[PDB]
Amino acid sequence: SHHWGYGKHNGPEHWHKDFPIAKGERQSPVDIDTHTAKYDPSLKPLSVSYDQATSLRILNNGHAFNVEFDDSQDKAVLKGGPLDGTYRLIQFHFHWGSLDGQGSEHTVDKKKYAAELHLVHWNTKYGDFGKAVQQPDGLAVLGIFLKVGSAKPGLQKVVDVLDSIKTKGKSADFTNFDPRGLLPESLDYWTYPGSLTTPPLLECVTWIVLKEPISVSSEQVLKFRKLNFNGEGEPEELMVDNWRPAQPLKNRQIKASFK
Ligand SMILES: CCCC(CCC)C(=O)N[C@@H]1Cc2ccc(S(N)(=O)=O)cc2C1
Numbered sequence: 114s115h116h117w118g119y120g121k122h123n124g125p126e127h128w129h130k131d132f133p134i135a136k137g138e139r140q141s142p143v144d145i146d147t148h149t150a151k152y153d154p155s156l157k158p159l160s161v162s163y164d165q166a167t168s169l170r171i172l173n174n175g176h177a178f179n180v181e182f183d184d185s186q187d188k189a190v191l192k193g194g195p196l197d198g199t200y201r202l203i204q205f206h207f208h209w210g211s212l213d214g215q216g217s218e219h220t221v222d223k224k225k226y227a228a229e230l231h232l233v234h235w236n237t238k239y240g241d242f243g244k245a246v247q248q249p250d251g252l253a254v255l256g257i258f259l260k261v262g263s264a265k266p267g268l269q270k271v272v273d274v275l276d277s278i279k280t281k282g283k284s285a286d287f288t289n290f291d292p293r294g295l296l297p298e299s300l301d302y303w304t305y306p307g308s309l310t311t312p313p314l315l316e317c318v319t320w321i322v323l324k325e326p327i328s329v330s331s332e333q334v335l336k337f338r339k340l341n342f343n344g345e346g347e348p349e350e351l352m353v354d355n356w357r358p359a360q361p362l363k364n365r366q367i368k369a370s371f372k
């Protein structure tokens with residue numbers, strides 16, 4: 114009944130009770146101190162190959178909405194950078210705020226963006242997602258910040274279908290969506306070992322956070338804010354501020370792909 118969420122009695126500060134790893138040694142998100150981050154020459158060129166990506170459905174899971182992809186074959190993959198091997202795209206989703214001044218999970222020199230896009234990939238050496246989340250290098254999440262300004266044309270198809278998945282549990286066919294339309298020009302990034310930012314908070318993620326944010330219009334993000342945390346027929350609880358705040362960096366160093 115009393116499941117985790119982002120409210121006063123079931124939010125981020127409560128998660129550790131059911132998920133003790135919430136106070137772990139490599140939790141995410143974290144604040145990215147740009148001056149302390151160090152350029153790493155050992156990093157190989159990052160490769161984002163989404164040309165063959167095949168989306169299948171979009172779902173409101175009561176915490177955010179997921180655009181799911183068919184990962185039964187080697188198509189949309191992420192490799193290079195800090196990664197060893199190939200990681201396959203399985204889904205992407207966002208975290209956003211109730212206001213333009215907040216919403217992102219990672220922060221840059223304490224600056225919060227309006228939202229943050231997470232493209233989730235699993236290490237193919239482990240067979241599938243389930244086995245991957247039992248490994249310290251099982252996942253790679255490409256994070257992209259969203260700022261409010263000009264509209265992002267490639268995001269509109271997502272925005273327009275949200276009306277069909279307003280409440281928790283609802284899903285809708287969502288084929289032929291090209292995630293390449295959500296990527297900024299530059300692939301400059303920061304990377305560090307972390308975790309899932311929502312329960313179960315598993316520490317199996319290599320985070321790759323792009324420095325360049327994408328711009329989305331006020332109208333686009335306002336539609337994100339029309340979604341509901343609640344299910345159909347229940348009192349309306351707007352899906353906003355579904356972000357976890359920065360966690361202790363502890364024994365970690367953030368590396369930059371650029372000088
Ligand atoms: C450990 C796997 C359990 C299942 C449960 C949902 C049916 C699951 O898919 N959880 C999802 C998987 C996933 C992937 C990335 C992130 S994030 N925010 O760090 O980018 C959060 C979560 C929670």
Ligand SMILES: [Zn+2]
Nearest residue numbers: 206208231310
């Ligand atoms: Zn996320």
